[PDB]
Amino acid sequence: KKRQWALEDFEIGRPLGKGKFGNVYLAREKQSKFILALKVLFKAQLEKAGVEHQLRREVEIQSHLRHPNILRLYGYFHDATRVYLILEYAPLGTVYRELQKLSKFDEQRTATYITELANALSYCHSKRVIHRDIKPENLLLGSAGELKIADFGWSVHAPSSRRDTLCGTLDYLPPEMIEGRMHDEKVDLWSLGVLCYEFLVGKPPFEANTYQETYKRISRVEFTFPDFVTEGARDLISRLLKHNPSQRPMLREVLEHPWITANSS
Ligand SMILES: NC(=O)c1ccc(Nc2nccc(Nc3ccccc3C(N)=O)n2)cc1
């Protein structure tokens, strides 16, 4: 951070999304005419929720980390009643939004996204940084439709022990993280497995009706496949969704897997 801004250095545009922490707007840096996103968070919420650190972690990590499949953080600043985050703007929304718009993905999008995601993680891991929050809602699409990871607030360094009171949903977390135990760079691989299954099926493999119900499904790795899911896909998903973190593939193994290579553009 060599420069410091102010809400006045921008021209806020249309609202992009989010709700309770604050909203995200399309922004235009007056000086340069640079387009970007401006996620505005209210101090009121921050404090009362005690996220001071996740925010610090987000602005922390995402500031340094620089990769084409990771969403950039350009800086931040806060006015009297809130904090602003200067973010890379991703022209094609979230992957979460695309999935609603398409229901399920073909083996090509699925394969591709997984690839871009692996490279980004492969890089994140380079720096012993585990995301631990890879869900389709934290995946944006670039001007060329490329995946771009965001939200490293829940992201920390590994190995780790943190038990952090709740995540809203357990869908993307692996047994270790739910079971409250120690975890590492492999948490991101179980998630990669979940995303893959979801992308092709339209629902995460452990979806349940109750938090409790899902924790059961997860903790026992109980998942089945629709008939349309091909064996190549099944193989890789079954390899990523291993109870034992140490039995999950390394990102290169994933990046070389036949089905991935046979369909990733
Ligand atoms: N409504 C759309 O077509 C649309 C949605 C999203 C983007 N891209 C984008 N880039 C950077 C940040 C960002 N923030 C968020 C927007 C919505 C929800 C959550 C966030 C967020 N806290 O990351 N969104 C572009 C268009």
Is any atom of ligand 1 closer than 6 Å to the C-beta of 241?
Answer: no
Give distance in angstroms: CA of 8 to centre of ligand 1. Answer: 21
Cα 228 to ligand 1 centroid, rounded to whole Å: 31
Residue from 74, 86, 140, 155 to probe ligand 1 pocket by mutation (most atoms less than 8 Å from CB): 140
CATH code, residues 5-93: 3.30.200.20
* Residues contributing to the annotated binding site: 20, 39, 88-90, 137-138, 151
Closest atom, ligand 1, to C-alpha of 138: 23
E-strand ranges in the chain read 10-17, 24-29, 34-42, 73-78, 82-87, 129-130, 139-141, 147-149, 156-157
Question: How many Å apart are CA 259 and CA 94, to the nearest integer?
Answer: 25
The CA distance from 139 to 104, in Å, is 16
CB 74 within 8 A of CB 36: yes
Both structure tokens of 216: 């059961």
Active-site positions?
133
Nearest CA to 196 among 153, 239, 167, 227? 239
Q: What is the rounded distance in angstroms from the CA atom of residue 210 to the CA atom of residue 207?
A: 9
Binding-site entries for ATP: 20, 39, 88-90, 137-138, 151
- Judge if the beta carbon of residue 150 lies within 6 A of ligand 1: yes
Phi, psi of 75 (to 5 degrees): 155, -165
Listed by start position, the domains of the chain span 5-93, 94-265
Which of 12, 16, 54 best tests ligand 1's pocket when mutated (most atoms within 8 Å of CB)?
16
193 burial class (0-12, 13-18, 19+ CB within 10 angstroms)?
A: buried
> Two tokens at 229?
């899911």
- The Cα 95–Cα 17 span in angstroms is 13
Whether the Cβ atoms of residue 255 and residue 119 lie closer than 8 Å to each other: yes
Number of other residues whose CB lies within 10 A of the CB of residue 66: 10
State whether residue 32 is helix, strand or coil. Answer: coil
Question: Percent helix, strand and coil across the chain, each rounded to 5?
Answer: 40, 20, 40
State both tokens at 55: 């925010």
Question: β-strand 10-17 against 34-42: which pairing, if any?
Answer: unpaired
Measuring CA to CA, which residue among 201, 74, 87, 107 is closest to residue 148?
Answer: 87
Q: Which CATH class is domain 94-265?
A: mainly alpha
Can you tell me which residue has the tokens 């046979």?
262
Determination technique for this PDB entry? X-ray
User: What letter represents residue 253's amino acid?
Assistant: E
Calculate helix-pair angle for 187-201, 107-126, nearest 10 degrees: 170
Separation in Å, CA 88 to CA 42, 75, 147, 149: 20, 10, 13, 11
What value, to the nearest 5°, has the Cα angle with vertex 92 and ends 99 and 1? 120
* Ligand 1 pocket check for 41: Cβ under 6 Å: no
Torsion-angle region of 120 (φ positive above 0: left; ψ -120 to 50: alpha; else: beta)? alpha
The upper half-sphere exposure of residue 150, i.e. CA atoms within 13 Å in the direction of its Cβ, equals 26
Distance of CA 247 from the midpoint of ligand 1 (Å): 35
Ligand 1 mutation pick, 62, 94, 151, max ligand atoms within 8 A of CB: 94
- Could you tell me if the CB of 111 is within 6 A of ligand 1? no
**Paired residues of 77 in beta bridges:** 84
Q: Peptide bond before 68: cis, by omega within 30 degrees of 0? A: no
CA of 130 to the centre of ligand 1 (A): 22
